[PDB]
Design a protein around this nucleic acid. Structure first.
Lengths: 227, 226
DNA sequence: GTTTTTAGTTTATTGG
DNA sequence: TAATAAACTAAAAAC
């Protein structure tokens, strides 16, 4: 129950205050690592193999390994090349219809809950996005790194909010140069009908209530078992 | 290019041999941890706080820590209490229209292509999913873990390849507990009607070609210093 | 064997 | 004080 980001939407000169929230959280049980012999929590020490001594974090540096195994100590100015990391405002690039986006790149989502002082300007954007059904492709800065993200509105009955989903880059989808589907397809139309009623008998409507994390609940029962 | 697992979609009687591929492979640059005094790589080795002696992994146990900080001695039989890990087939539950699912739950995507020489069984389902235009929800199993996923098709011009996306559980979405947004705001229609074309001034169409990871390319340019 | 892929696990900022 | 990204181990299936 705590926000993550506190900035504004920098589309032109609009600057609506927004309180980004973590839309989803990993309810999956995260365990801990302990030593059964002596009941001791485990800690990792980073010790060089060749010499064998402990060091503080501040004396090491990032190193990119190429095919030949070269090591490069990245200079501070090279990392500081981006002026967008200095930026702390969501920059808006364009607006695209919601049906013109592909559902594969939607990686992680966050809420956009505004500040009540100027909520009138926020509700205008929300109602406009509900009207034109236009998704917004926005540059997103977070955790000192920049991710391409989308901005769109999802009704929740009582109140409408806009939601931000971080997409992968367009170069982050492998092109499937598959040769097996270039084979000529020979299907008699008599067979095509059978697949119809087979799926149609399995008809249903999306019911999120019925679905459960089957393993996680049975493992959670273990937690209550011991204590 | 190497596959991940080789099973087969198995609901009722249909059993189409399939070869799952990784749809997205993060090409973001990954770095090792290195310091100059050794001029070499770094290793993580595990020690006990109280003992102070290096211990092997094989004599350590899973532990869950509640608010009280109590231990949990995880055994093998209780971990094996769920036999879905033994399954190596994609189990299908139902089919749902593509418009009845919302795009938030998609987490990671995987491709689906046949393995056997006969591809008729694949193409039947592929053409079926492009006619009824309905998704399919599976009880996907992968890497001794079970995750809910869904089947749907992305026509790539020449092939009707269908893909699988792993969705989060319905309890994995936090409720929108904002009691401030329900406030009634009176908007003059003039503001909305002049904001209409204001938004439309920035209208465009999706052009993935011109979008790039600027930071990744600048950093890569730094790597090519050699 | 093989290097990829993937899930499990401290850990080190940073921002409410 | 809690969430997100670095970076490594540690299985662990395909062929």
């Amino acid at each position: 129950m705590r926000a993550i980001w506190t900035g504004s939407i920098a589309f032109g000169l609009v600057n609506v205050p927004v309180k980004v929230y973590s839309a989803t959280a990993d309810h999956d049980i995260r365990f801990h690592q302990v030593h059964a012999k002596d009941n001791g929590r485990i800690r990792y020490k980073r010790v060089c193999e060749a010499c064998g001594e402990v060091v503080d974090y501040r004396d090491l540096a990032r190193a990119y390994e190429s095919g030949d195994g070269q090591m490069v100590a990245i200079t501070d100015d090279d990392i500081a090349s981006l002026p967008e990391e200095r930026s702390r405002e969501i920059e808006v690039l364009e607006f695209v219809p919601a049906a013109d986006v592909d559902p594969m790149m939607f990686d992680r989502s966050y809420f956009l809950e505004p500040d009540s002082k100027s909520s009138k300007s926020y509700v205008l954007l929300a109602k406009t996005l509900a009207e034109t059904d236009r998704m917004a492709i926005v540059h997103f800065t977070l955790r000192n790194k920049t991710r391409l993200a989308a901005l769109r509105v999802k009704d929740f009955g009582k109140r409408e909010v806009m939601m931000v989903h971080t997409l992968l880059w367009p170069d982050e989808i492998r092109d499937p140069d598959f040769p097996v589907l270039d084979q000529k397809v020979e299907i008699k139309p008599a067979e095509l009908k059978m697949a119809g009623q087979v799926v149609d008998s399995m008809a249903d409507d999306f019911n999120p209530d019925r679905y459960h994390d089957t393993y996680q609940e049975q493992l959670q029962e273990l937690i209550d078992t011991k204590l």
